[PDB]
């Protein structure tokens, strides 16, 4: 019943995604380097509320809003997805 | 006098222009536009509230005397906020002249019935209601006139399809004529005829 | 005396259209592309509304193209995009709007055909 | 947002016109079945009247309601005066329509229409 | 074999090399018993008991928006960033380059005309191939 | 001119193998049930899918969502792209980030292991347009193609 | 599928259903409904007919242009049967008389002609074959009509093993010889019945139910090699049925028993007409035969058809039998007949 | 020339013929397939090629105003003949 895929949607220029943009610039390479086999799909799009998608076994999905989240809270939200697995 | 060109009659153009501004001066409450065409037809464009006052003035005023309602019709122009243009074509036997009066309305707004001004308008307004769906208030007996009993929609609207939505046939099982969704053995063929080159510069619209 | 009506214009219940051809249709609002075979631009001035293409089949008797779509030939003309969108909302049609494509302005120079040192020098006339 | 009314100035006034029409349609069905010699029952006809009123229960524009009542009244006048024929009265029941399944799979089998 | 629709026969989304999303329009309907491709799989899922949660073209496009939000921004090129990170990760695993010279599959015009099922089935392309070779 | 291939070799009916192992026409209901049966007996790595070159995005997600419901992730494409490092995690890694119109803004173009004339004819046309009007410089690593 | 038989359209008059059907005996009572339902959806119908062309005119408006094709045929001429069936995908056999003529007897119409059609249809490679038999078909039946149905039903089974065989009860409809039959007895005063109609039970079935069942069998892949019993939803005592017929028609009902022997004498007297007999001895036997109960055979419900009660459609058939005084009585004015639970 | 298919059905000058197994040929049963047996492709090939002296010749199809629009045919290519695009007559430059 474990995790299969993670998607991060964010805007390139919006201030609501600044923390998410910060997280990718700083902690993405080491997180990917930690999980070499787990697809982490970062998909930018203009004027979209930043959001996290986690896909577990047999297609179950959950999404978390990251609007206004800090670089710290993004690390927390992913750390939830990578830790507890629904 | 070039043989193939329609001659221009300027005495009538001046006469119609004079009467046009005469109407506008007398009825500024309702008249929005007055124009005369290059083939000498005067059109008065009015606010819909002025249908009865304008038509009554044109019928009764001694310098108008438009006693005959030649025609009353509507035009559907979907791009407009008020899509329906209502057109009264009047004739003056006394002054051997014609005038056109135009107003507007939409799907949900009624127009005052002009039957009290011209009894000719009774069936014309029934036709406009039947074919365009424009409701006329205080009409003596408004109801479909041209379409089939129970027909749904207003065929002369531009968004009504040419072949309609239903068609009839005789069904032997129920021993009566039945109505069913329209299917055509040969679809009507749409032709794109417009040339991509401008034809009439004089009517060019600014960009 | 005027009344205050405070809802979006909806005329779907008084248009006579069947339910199938309101909810299931997809209207396209667009300015037609210029037919590439001709240089005239006079057919790219007005906005158009068309509906999604549906099945056509061959008539068994003659092989003609039969259809069951009452809207197959319906095309509407509008002055502006807003007018077309206003029409689509009150009739209850889902619609897609494609932005107008205006040719980009170009810099043309006949004298550039004879450049002293640039590649725009033409080898024939 | 100030528009000219047709009849009813607001929804409460319009709804009263709806109920007056519904009573007239409800009372007329027994005569319609008798006069047109329809094989349906008085219950079947009255159920059809309900069905036609129920499909327009989501309207909140008093003007749209007034037009529906106007068209309903005209629709009733044709029936009472026997301007309609039996074919026109029985067009409400679509007796020759083969039912069209509304589920995805049944549609998927029969064609491309959604 | 499940017969599907060609690109002229469906309203489908395609993303070009820029990442620009664009949609086709139905010009004709599929032939015979062929069906819209996403509808075949949706129909299959219901039969299999694992019904997918979208029954129309618009709904399945809402699903595309949840996976990659730019797949529904039609005619828009959404910019993509973070080349610095993609370059850092590309240096983790070293690998050798082959001694083979870089040779594209298409060297001359004859190699251009047939490259997919549609053009392979095309008699006009076959005429073109015969012409350039001969 | 390849549109005339849409009138040839077309699949117009579902097919299944008969007792002789030969393809024979059948109905959607039969063909779908036969596939539906096998899909219910397999899970995970036993079920895979390959997407060809002409597949639309609506079909691509529907097939992924279906195979994800048997806990399969083997959703593959024929065209290769290296997965090392970022792989497909970052869109910039597998896009033409300058855009087609951006070629007109470049002063140097370095082409590597490609024949844009046949791979992307209208992208090669854009390069020649810049080559001609902007005096663009072009360099190529690979087979010396015209 | 050949490309020209793949369905297209939305199921209307101009659509293509993919069915190419030869309907034998399409000019009778059941035939006009079957042809109507095939034409509605855009089927190619071949109507081989024996009668004068004027008597097929009511069939012409049932199909789009070209969809109804008429041919001549002779029940004894097997060349004329290949011509009619050799382009078809389904063959429907609806041939039958309720009387014997000088030229055709019950064996001819219910054995020799059904067998010839099936044997020729089998040779032509016709995929599907629908044969109409009778609910009460039995070898030991007192009615020779029903004895031939049993022999014919069996013969069609060996000849065309994959044939769908349908066994309807008595059918009621505008042009039936059932409800119309009872309503017409008024011309003789009382209504004679064997044992006062207290010994016979009937389960009549609506014509449209039978037609829909036939049409669903063509399309249902599981109807092949099966035998169906098309019966109505309610079983009635004959006396209750005939009394209800007279109530709906608003005609005075004067039943009186008539013994079996004396009421064959009347049947023999009506057989002398060289025209269509008003009644026959065999007709007397069939009307008084109790409808069989055959639970082992699938019914209308197994073909997606929901049987129509006699009460909904009796007025549709019997209104024309009323006098002016009663023409406008509604459906509710007559209480339903008592049923056998 | 009008041909008969192995099913016996005549082949039209447009190449149309119901293939064996096409139900649609039932429409001809007890009737006939209307086929015009003067194939225009064959008739025009029987005309002699006309030798002319000039490099350019004109064709109006004959009959002046009763023919087709007047066209002009180049005859410089000596491997082939100049054919009228309206009526199919052929022309040749004599030496
Ligand atoms: N109550 C019912 O109606 C029931 C009917 N059935 C069976 O259903 C079938 C049709 O019923 P129905 O339609 O009422 O019967 P009809 O008598 O109403 O029509 C019978 C058809 O058979 C044709 N036919 C009869 N004899 C011959 C013949 N010797 N040669 C050629 N054609 C012939 C007639 O053609 P023409 O018109 O040219 O004479 C007619 O088209 C019959 O098999 C009947 O036994 C079964 C159970 C009950
Ligand atoms: Zn010529």
Swiss-Prot record, chain A:
N6-succinyllysine modification, residue list: 51
GO cellular component: a single term: mitochondrial membrane
Localization per record: Mitochondrion inner membrane
Keywords of the record: Acetylation, Disulfide bond, Electron transport, Membrane, Mitochondrion, Mitochondrion inner membrane, Respiratory chain, Transport
PANTHER family per UniProt: NADH DEHYDROGENASE [UBIQUINONE] 1 ALPHA SUBCOMPLEX SUBUNIT 2 (PTHR12878:SF0), NADH-UBIQUINONE OXIDOREDUCTASE B8 SUBUNIT (PTHR12878)
Quaternary data: Complex I is composed of 45 different subunits.
Protein name: NADH dehydrogenase [ubiquinone] 1 alpha subcomplex subunit 2
Organism: Bos taurus (Bovine)
Species classification: Eukaryota, Metazoa, Chordata, Craniata, Vertebrata
Curated annotation (Swiss-Prot), chain B:
Class of this enzyme: translocase
Membrane topology summary: Peripheral membrane protein
GO biological process, one term: mitochondrial respiratory chain complex I assembly
UniProt keyword annotations, A-Z: Electron transport, Membrane, Mitochondrion, Mitochondrion inner membrane, NAD, Oxidoreductase, Respiratory chain, Transit peptide, Translocase, Transport, Ubiquinone
Catalytic activity: a ubiquinone + NADH + 5 H(+)(in) = a ubiquinol + NAD(+) + 4 H(+)(out)
GO MF annotation, one: NADH dehydrogenase activity
GO cellular component, as recorded: mitochondrial inner membrane; mitochondrial membrane; respiratory chain complex I
Subcellular location: Mitochondrion inner membrane
The EC number(s) this enzyme carries: 7.1.1.2
Principal location: mitochondrion
Family: Belongs to the complex I 30 kDa subunit family.
Function according to Swiss-Prot or TrEMBL: Core subunit of the mitochondrial membrane respiratory chain NADH dehydrogenase (Complex I) which catalyzes electron transfer from NADH through the respiratory chain, using ubiquinone as an electron acceptor. Essential for the catalytic activity and assembly of complex I.
Subunit composition and interactions: Core subunit of respiratory chain NADH dehydrogenase (Complex I) which is composed of 45 different subunits. Interacts with NDUFAF3. Interacts with RAB5IF. Found in subcomplexes containing subunits NDUFS2, MT-ND1 and NDUFA13.
Protein name as annotated: NADH dehydrogenase [ubiquinone] iron-sulfur protein 3, mitochondrial
Organism: Bos taurus (Bovine)
Region of the whole protein represented: 45 to 251 of 266
Curated annotation (Swiss-Prot), chain E:
Localization (cell): Mitochondrion inner membrane
Origin superkingdom: Eukaryota
Chain positions with N6-acetyllysine modification: 127
Family: Belongs to the complex I 75 kDa subunit family.
Chain's role: Core subunit of the mitochondrial membrane respiratory chain NADH dehydrogenase (Complex I) which catalyzes electron transfer from NADH through the respiratory chain, using ubiquinone as an electron acceptor. Essential for catalysing the entry and efficient transfer of electrons within complex I. Plays a key role in the assembly and stability of complex I and participates in the association of complex I with ubiquinol-cytochrome reductase complex (Complex III) to form supercomplexes.
Description of how the protein assembles with itself and partners: Core subunit of respiratory chain NADH dehydrogenase (Complex I) which is composed of 45 different subunits. This is the largest subunit of complex I and it is a component of the iron-sulfur (IP) fragment of the enzyme. Complex I associates with ubiquinol-cytochrome reductase complex (Complex III) to form supercomplexes. Interacts with MDM2 and AKAP1.
Protein name: NADH-ubiquinone oxidoreductase 75 kDa subunit, mitochondrial
Residues of the full protein shown: 583 to 716 of 727
UniProtKB/Swiss-Prot annotation, chain H:
A single GO cellular-component term on record: respiratory chain complex I
Location in or out of the cell: Mitochondrion inner membrane
Disulfide bridge map: none
Keyword terms, alphabetized: Electron transport, Membrane, Mitochondrion, Mitochondrion inner membrane, Respiratory chain, Transit peptide, Transport
Broad class of where this protein is predominantly found: mitochondrion
Keyword Transit peptide part of the UniProt annotation: yes
Membrane-topology descriptor: Peripheral membrane protein
GO BP terms, alphabetized: mitochondrial electron transport, NADH to ubiquinone
Task performed by this protein: Accessory subunit of the mitochondrial membrane respiratory chain NADH dehydrogenase (Complex I), that is believed not to be involved in catalysis. Complex I functions in the transfer of electrons from NADH to the respiratory chain. The immediate electron acceptor for the enzyme is believed to be ubiquinone.
Assembly behavior: Mammalian complex I is composed of 45 different subunits. This is a component of the iron-sulfur (IP) fragment of the enzyme.
Record-stated family: Belongs to the complex I NDUFS6 subunit family.
This protein's name: NADH dehydrogenase [ubiquinone] iron-sulfur protein 6, mitochondrial
Gene source species: Bos taurus (Bovine)
